[PDB]
Amino acid sequence: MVLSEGEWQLVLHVWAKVEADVAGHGQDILIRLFKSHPETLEKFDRFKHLKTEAEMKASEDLKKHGVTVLTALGAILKKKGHHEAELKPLAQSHATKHKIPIKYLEFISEAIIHVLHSRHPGNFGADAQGAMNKALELFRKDIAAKYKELGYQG
Numbered sequence: 001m002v003l004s005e006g007e008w009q010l011v012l013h014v015w016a017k018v019e020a021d022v023a024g025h026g027q028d029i030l031i032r033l034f035k036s037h038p039e040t041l042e043k044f045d046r047f048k049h050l051k052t053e054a055e056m057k058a059s060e061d062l063k064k065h066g067v068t069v070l071t072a073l074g075a076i077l078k079k080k081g082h083h084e085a086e087l088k089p090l091a092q093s094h095a096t097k098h099k100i101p102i103k104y105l106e107f108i109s110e111a112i113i114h115v116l117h118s119r120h121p122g123n124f125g126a127d128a129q130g131a132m133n134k135a136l137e138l139f140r141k142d143i144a145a146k147y148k149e150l151g152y153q154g
């Protein structure tokens with residue numbers, strides 16, 4: 001799959017808004033992931049004790065993790081497809097140490113889209129959402145191929 005420059009610009013235009021407060025967007029996205037698919041929280045040994053959204057919102061470490069996650073994703077999106085180097089370390093740690101199934105990467109992609117759709121109607125209309133979905137599908141496709149090369153393809 002290959003995105004056009006126009007599609008990448010729609011992706012980078014809404015990411016620019018996420019960057020106005022990456023910590024707040026990361027909290028919303030991780031909390032939306034854990035609430036919609038609670039089995040995903042079990043993969044975090046640092047955060048699986050959190051019982052409620054209030055506990056998640058008050059966790060300073062979770063917030064800092066959200067910033068780490070979205071900043072790594074932003075660096076991958078800014079590469080506009082040329083993200084081979086960025087995907088190596090990510091795929092190795094997610095396939096071998098954290099053990100994250102592609103289906104869970106699908107879940108977080110769904111959470112990212114949900115949060116952008118509600119926080120940014122001005123930059124996340126139908127065409128912009130379609131472009132972001134395309135960029136995240138490319139990210140999952142390339143990550144899955146790497147998983148396979150690493151011996152996981154889960």
Ligand code: HEM
Nearest residue numbers: 040043044046068069072073089090093098100104105108
């Ligand atoms: C857009 C997708 C994702 C990105 C860009 C992302 C990014 C990161 C980054 C940069 C780290 C820290 C460095 C590393 O260990 O590689 C990290 C750690 C981790 N990620 Fe991901 N991640 C993503 C999705 C997920 C998903 C869906 C899960 C689980 C359902 C997950 C679980 C973890 C865990 C368990 C850690 C370690 C947390 C800790 O510090 O305690 N990741 N992720």
